[PDB]
Design a binder for this molecule. Structure first.
Ligand SMILES: Cc1cc2nc3c(=O)[nH]c(=O)nc-3n(C[C@H](O)[C@H](O)[C@H](O)COP(=O)(O)OP(=O)(O)OC[C@H]3O[C@@H](n4cnc5c(N)ncnc54)[C@H](O)[C@@H]3O)c2cc1C
Ligand SMILES: *N(O)c1cc(C(F)(F)F)cc2c(=O)nc(N3CCC4(CC3)OC[C@H](C)O4)sc12
Length: 412
């Protein structure tokens, strides 16, 4: 039942207070939206598990629908590879449910604690982006509650393709997704055949990813060094691989294939690994991508980070593949970097500086990772933003759907 609560992003900054609804009944959500439309307060926004670091899933003064309560899985079909799920279904929940059927979650982020609705809302990406694209590429259909109380059937190629692609990466600003059909990835096992490599510099890391080699693997990411001075800066521990076939597993693991003095270094070949072993090996979360061809410019950001004295120990490096049709979708082909800055004096001035260099080089920031950037910067980082706003207003003219991010980045 609707009640006032303090809500925060994962980064635990900029708290605001809102009214919160938690229901497993789609009809209560419809009535709440229609009621909010007829009364027109500060607005409605859907919330998933709250794994975004910023302010996209909160609406100070308004209403927030806690979506995790709406978590029924309707059907799993190995033949079509299709899965019909409530937007509040967890990726962890869906994984556990679809694995015995031989189906794999097509895009897996760093944590399995995200809703389908939040996966779509931020168009999440994973280690397999260069081969699979982002989460939006794998949504066959979705049911979207709009400001007028209508539930719209949306498809990537069909009649409402425009609303579909404005919803993907739309950060809940086109309405509340109630339900989706996801096309899962077929798999024989829950294991990876993996290669490990180590490089000695930023240049080597770049070159390693630049020789067409990435096409040999479905999944690829790397940790890199952001603390050492050149020539050691950028040296990386690269982890690449693909889902194993059954005949590639040792016999001891073939029993249960879909189950949930040596020198130890980062170089190995054709290693069989489970999900934990392949993935796993306050703080300002910062993520940016610059275009592939902007190699020297990308290098300059990494160098400047190191020179700045802001020291990040947890950094992820990935080469993104082609993007998709969503105007607000974060990934573009090019160099993606996640960095974790300990909060210190001068950090905020520095990230402001980083934002503008990313802007100049043709790059963008991720909505799931931001709480600080300015509206003029963000608009400029997404060339299709005005096209998106026009679509958003067509389905929500009176601004029934709103969030702290939407007011901050002027997305209404
Ligand atoms: C440890 C960690 C690792 C991560 N790794 C990755 C990664 O590798 N790749 C990556 O892309 N992201 C990553 N993320 C970010 C995360 O995947 C996204 O922020 C995701 O959107 C969070 O899902 P959520 O269910 O918590 O949604 P929330 O954070 O609650 O909300 C996200 C947005 O989606 C909207 N939304 C949520 N549910 C609905 C719905 N039912 N209908 C309409 N709109 C909705 C909200 O309005 C909000 O704008 C990571 C986060 C953490 C904490
Ligand atoms: N950046 O946040 C990031 C990018 C990618 C990639 F897909 F672009 F390559 C992948 C990625 C990832 O796989 N895991 C991340 N984690 C964040 C920190 C971590 C591990 C997972 O450490 C503990 C905490 C619970 O999560 S970030 C990431």
């Amino acid at each position: 039942p609707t009640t006032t609560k303090r809500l925060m992003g994962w980064g635990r900054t900029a708290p605001t207070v809102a009214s919160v609804l938690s229901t497993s009944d789609p009809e209560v959500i419809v009535r709440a939206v229609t009621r909010a439309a007829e009364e027109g307060g500060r607005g409605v926004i859907a919330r998933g598990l709250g794994r975004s670091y910023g302010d996209n899933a909160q609406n100070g003064g308004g209403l927030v629908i806690d979506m995790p309560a709406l978590n029924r899985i309707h059907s799993i079909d190995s033949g079509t590879r299709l899965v019909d799920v409530d937007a509040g279904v967890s990726l962890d929940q869906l994984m556990k449910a679809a694995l015995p059927h031989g189906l794999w979650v097509p895009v897996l982020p760093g944590t399995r604690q995200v809703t389908v609705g939040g996966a779509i809302g931020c168009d999440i990406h994973g280690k397999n982006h260069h081969s699979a694209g982002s989460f939006g590429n794998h949504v066959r259909s979705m049911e979207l509650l709009t400001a007028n109380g209508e539930v719209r059937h949306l498809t990537p190629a069909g009649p409402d393709s425009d609303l579909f692609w404005a919803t993907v990466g739309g950060n809940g600003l086109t309405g509340i997704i109630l339900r989706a059909t996801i096309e899962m990835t077929p798999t024989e096992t829950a294991y990876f055949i993996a290669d490990g490599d180590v490089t000695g510099s930023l240049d080597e890391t770049i070159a390693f990813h630049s020789d067409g080699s990435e096409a040999n693997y479905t999944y690829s990411s790397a940790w890199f060094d952001a603390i050492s001075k050149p020539p050691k800066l950028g040296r990386a521990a690269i982890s690449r691989g693909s889902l194993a076939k059954l005949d590639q597993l040792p016999s001891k693991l073939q029993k249960d294939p879909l189950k949930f003095w040596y020198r130890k270094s980062g170089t190995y070949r054709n290693k069989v690994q489970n999900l934990t072993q392949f993935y796993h090996p306050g703080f300002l979360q910062y993520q940016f991508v610059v275009p592939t061809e902007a190699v020297e410019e990308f290098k300059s950001i990494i160098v400047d980070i190191q020179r700045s004295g802001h020291y990040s120990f947890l950094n992820v490096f990935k080469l993104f593949g082609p993007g998709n049709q969503a105007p607000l979708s974060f990934p573009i082909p090019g160099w993606n970097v996640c960095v974790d800055f300990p909060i210190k004096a001068g950090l905020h001035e520095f990230v402001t500086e980083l934002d503008r260099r990313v802007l100049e080089f043709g790059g963008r920031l991720y909505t799931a990772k931001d709480s600080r950037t300015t509206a003029e910067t963000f608009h400029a980082m997404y060339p299709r933003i005005d096209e998106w706003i026009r679509i958003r207003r067509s389905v929500d003219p009176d601004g029934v759907f709103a969030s702290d991010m939407a007011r901050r980045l002027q997305l209404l």
